[PDB]
């Protein structure tokens, strides 16, 4: 820890160091929105009841699947006022803005991966 | 239903008004489909075509059995009281079937013409079947008896359908039927359609005697209990002198059921 | 027929009806020329908005500029062209970042046609209504021009005309094109003649047309737009030539 | 207003939500259940419609427990009843897991009511069809009773009745003095009520299930011992002339 | 969702009318009167009295757990009107939003921000084709250290506003007309005057006599910013002092 | 054709017709069943054609045991030789690609019988309503341009609401109403169409409303607390069988 | 009183008033549009024989192969749709080879029929399928218990058989087999 | 006939109020074969019946295996049977691995009901079609728990859910007195006699259409088939009449 | 029409029914007028809060952005606050990078793209709103108008809103360029007067100028002074 049970499409990534975290501010930056949402969900589930996290997360799921196709930039106008970051500009949009992506994948491959078919 | 997220779904219709409203290139496709779906009579004498069945000869009794259970009942009970010969059958191309529609002729007094047709006629071929079997204006002396079986989940009542008793017999008789009924008649909320209804409607509108018999069995696969339940039928003038050997017929019916027809593998 | 509610269903004869209907959307836009000459590659246009309360804007409203040489012209629903032009600029710049050469035509036209078609196979999104017309130069195939399609059927056209009244303009262009020997001035005169032949015959003016060229000189491809006063004398010369028909 | 009664997220020209009202009506065709609070305790009772004698005591019951000092008397669709009981168990478990002591009744009732309301807001899940009672007891707060309607109602009742035979039960319960009584006669009153309102042309077998929590059990929910149940049964049977 | 959106000009939220009106939200507006209530909130110059109505369907139901006057923050109230099953959720949502704001900026919220947040999170439910616009009337109350007392009202559509007096319920029109007539006469007010005006408006709109224990009153004052609910004694005293 | 129940066929000389039309909800069929049950009329003959799906059943008007044992074909007629009223009781769906011959045969029989008036009761889809149809009553009327000079003044006095043109009429869900109207516009046969917007599901109140709306003009009943029209004795098990045991 | 057109065959998960899930029944009905096949189980091995029905003479005879290897001792005869059968065969091969690698022994025919049926059971709601597999297989082989021949239908079962046809005119190939089977005749 | 619009899916309530899909599934489960579920003080016999696709083919499996102390039957759809027995086996194995005691039936059946309750609410899913007759003795005498297409399980003493079985129920209720003190042989004889009523007239129970399975005090759950079932099927009197 | 009821399908002539319906909806709103002059721009509009029960403070229409961009809606009230917040967030996002204020054109393009993004998708309605925005960059005044589908125009004297055809006809014979704000404000007031259904009051006009100082919004007493004059 998985065995094999196309290398040109995905290659040149040794197994050595993905199970070896980089500079300690790695798991607190690669996964930040997920961790903040998890903490808020746990707090609400503990103090307010079991209805609020279920309702809010299923609202997230409902609003998530109306954006443009993955191979184009997503405006994400909605889901933002609902998340609570409506005006909380920070080190997430001014640095390496995804609109000007330096590298871009194939459309069919990206959409079929987003669907999870692969 | 909803093919993808957010798609607007039209409410399914009930009356049947969803149908919409030509150039020569489309003009022929309809006729090809109609000719393929058209019904023709192919009485197996020598690739015959035949004019109607009752035009070439008259008869007094024209009992017709529709459904596999009824065909089994007629082929088990009334076949040994004489010898029968085949006069013809029919060919159909309904999308639900194709299994035969062969008629029978008794070498004795030919007033009896018991029929066996388990094929499922479509919702439009029935009128053509009536046109090609009877005609336009037959005699006013025939008596018609129909035996059919329907699923038990059709009878409507205040009590639970499952809680209802074992399969029973119900009858529907026309106005011109002096003979009495051997079972209670069907209640008002229940109706019957398709070929038995077409036959009964034709008999009623052409002022000839008729009688209908239904069986509300809970199992559609052929068996012994349901076909044995048809016992009280053999006590009327519609079919009285055609029964001559009960126990041997029961034995041959048991042997026929022993053949173990291909059941459904969806269940256990 | 009834088989046109969603853009994922075929027909008994066999056809995608939704994209066929979307093909008619580009039939309600201004005409677009773009005949190809020996030296330059002229590209005319048309400005539908001719109201009296509109202020001028840079680089007209149709002709764009992709990276350094290639331009484009749009047609149809203009609300969906600002996204395509932006993404096409992005793909050109991304290719330049990858390989340090100016992009050829194919690796741009095919790249955009890929997305344009991909929105016609994942039902739940209407296809783009556009008729983008391309233009540019490279060092592998000289000068060439391409014309796109909402479904995606790009072909290396030498002279075409998208938009309304396309049939008559294309036919008369086919009947009056001097293939092989072609000059920039003669190409411009032919474009003016074609524009006068089409349209509602309003005699045109400097407030109804836009012209872009691609003269390549001094080893540095440039794109220039003719001035407002740079076409009035051209129209006057064409009118004089037309009136000089002699006859009797 | 037929036509708009096909999804939860669809109003009506009058303004009502028809799926919710259909769920309201769908709980009526069931058995009946009542619950009364005395001065220092509560008590319930359900007419368990016993099917053929193939079953036995301890069959599908409608007197679940949610904690050491709370319990319900749900009367409706049984699968949704079990799901709601599990949800309430999980809620009380979580509260005790980190906040100490035991959950007050009001908070648990509010949480369960809001959870059961959460389904009628979306076009993905059907609303719950079931009534719901959550009587319990405390040491200092006293004895409290709550009823939760399928959609959103979480009112607090002195004593009510849920199920098919409900109007007659309410009318008969109206004529009581359930503010200065004890837990030794309200049981007999409940038995006489459940036998004064019980149809016999469509119902054949009965088995009363009773449970009380109060000072007699110092804050614990359990079924009544068989002796008291039998005595109440005999008294109620002999009371009918 | 594998059920689709019902076809029709008024059967779903995301379909525009031929003339351009959202019929579903109009049905939502009509849905408040279905329950049947009336609420009046009047602001004077140093008080923000709120009056409402209480109806007991029967006798068995307890009279202490049927209130329609909840508490949002330490010094903000609400007079929620309409379907209870949706106000009971909007109240929790507002409480969570207020707690989050206090955690993120460290002071009590001005009423306008809470109203705007509620309006936005209610409006976001009127675009996705999976939601139902929950029908309520979010009427706020409270005092501010920069502008004094304030009364704000919100609607299921999401359009909020600032009112010097508000009536919400099944008798909105005549109550609003009466308040409009009364406000234009005199400008100054006081706690007793505001309470008497609210009670008189409610009585003249319902055209019925008010029992001493039928109406609850929640107020906030400059001297006592803490949100408090008038007891039975004070309401009875004011009712018997009225018209005497 | 029209097959009489008896040996001979009684002749209808100028009799008002009450034939229904298939549409969504079977509103017309339910209303006309109510009319037949409340007028206490009797059967005089049968209508036989190879267009309706064949179906047979017991007597739908089994008031007592005297007439509770009879057959009932899909199409049958009724009459009342007191005020010139005859009605049809179509109670089956139409076989596909057979509407036109049935309409032609029925119109031919209407012409041959020499009747006075014809009245058609049908319905329409409710969701296909423009904004002008919202804040208005759903009840409406439509008449061919041959009955105006007779009862148009009375209809205007009743203050009814006319159809909306386009320029041809198009009412969705009519099924056969458009066919009857169109093939009557050229045969000089007069009839009135009284439809009502409705949605599928439960429609008994809408049937009652349509019956009352028709009575508002025909004055079939006493001129005008709800026990006016007698509900037929066949409307017991509308929603199938009873509740299965142990489910609740 | 009235006859109404109600359809329940549209929708992969819809129960008809009396059961009998219509979509699976239609999938089973769709098998007959294919090629006939036969298989006889005998004490000294099993035999298969599957027709080909070449469309044109130009088509290479070995291009189409209903018979297909699964392992050194298991063979099966597909019918009906082709691509779905190819997918099933690929999954079966992968599964049996993986099991051989793991437990280091040979397959048992029931232990692979169970696996393939479990895979085919996933019809319903992730590269999950959306329609029943309109195919049919006649697994055959020899194991420790002897020679066995398993039949697997599209829906869910792997009933053991001795001689059972699968293609069109199955009645003619079934009645005659019933009339001729002897359970002790030689392989020749 | 006012049901076409309210039965196409499962998340809609009829105006009367009842999920029609649940009733349709409960009607569907009646397609199969009878299965008696008798029990005693020490042993819980589980006798089933087997159909036949044809004379040439072999019969289906109706008595699966779960663990050393529990064995289920099956009736109805054979598709979801394996999909549910997988969950059975996985839960039993997890309970044996984490703790070190056999998982009691009373929690296993509740877990199965909780799992089967999920699909009846969310869209795009259908209820299961099994008729399980879970049997097994763990610590407090053998139990016989029934499962329905709806997630509403019953406790039981003896019943025969499945195919035509009302006569089987009547016979099982007539003689429901001696099942508390008998040896294994007498209980098996009673089970086979009860099953014989289901089989049509002039038909006997051969060796190839019975699947007697027995679990009791000191013997693990074992399934009997082929000639091994002959010793139990010896006396059986001579004929029902 | 079956081809209607869904914004993802083209009618068999070439159009989008939902987009045209939303355009008609935003046309059926509140009149608004914008005038561009050689010195600056003026935006004038009126509110439906006629009754004295409402308040002058709190809710407000012409919300400024940063210091040089100001807008005004003529559509659905609760359906542009989110758009305004997004516009301000975009302005700040541009301001952190490129340490110099947003030019108008980039903001117009970005807001137009984000508004259009709810057209091409499937299952969400388009925004019912159409807003003008005024800017002042490089010593030049800028005026633009946005459409529900999204297509910016370099308009000069648009009077879009309720009864906008009459406003356009009236404005097509008064504006002549080379004007200061003093005459432009009077012209805008006259355009509003042409269609107001009543007389202008002290609390019915929300004019806001964008001269070379910022985006000052005229005080109510100043509006009274201009209205009297």
Residue numbers in the entry:
A (entry chain H): 13, 15 to 18, 29 to 141
B (entry chain I): 2 to 22, 30 to 58, 60 to 107, 119 to 288
C (entry chain B): 3 to 250
D (entry chain F): 5 to 245
E (entry chain G): 1 to 244
F (entry chain J): 1 to 166, 177 to 234, 241 to 264
G (entry chain D): 1 to 125, 130 to 192
H (entry chain E): 1 to 241
Give me lines lifted from the publication on this model.
In addition to mature CP, detailed analysis of the cryo-EM data from the higher-molecular-weight fraction revealed two supra-20S structures, referred to as ‘preholo 20S CP’ and ‘premature 20S CP’ (right). The most striking differences between structure 5 and preholo 20S CP are in the conformations of the β subunits. Fusion of two half-CPs coaxes the proteases toward active conformations. Overall, the structural similarity of β1, β2 and β5 between the preholo 20S intermediate and mature 20S CP is consistent, with fusion having a major role in driving autocatalytic activation. Interestingly, in the preholo 20S CP structure, density corresponding to the propeptides continues from the β2 and β5 active sites. Although the resolution of our structures precludes precise placement of atoms and visualization of water molecules, the preholo 20S CP intermediate structure shows features poised to impact these facets of propeptide maturation. First, the β2 and β5 propeptides make numerous contacts that impact their orientation. For the β2 propeptide, these mirror those in structure 5 and include interactions with β3, β4, α3 and POMP. Meanwhile, residues 52–59 of the β5 propeptide retain contacts with β6. The α-ring is similar across structures 2–5 and the preholo 20S CP structure, where it is largely occluded by elements coming from both directions.
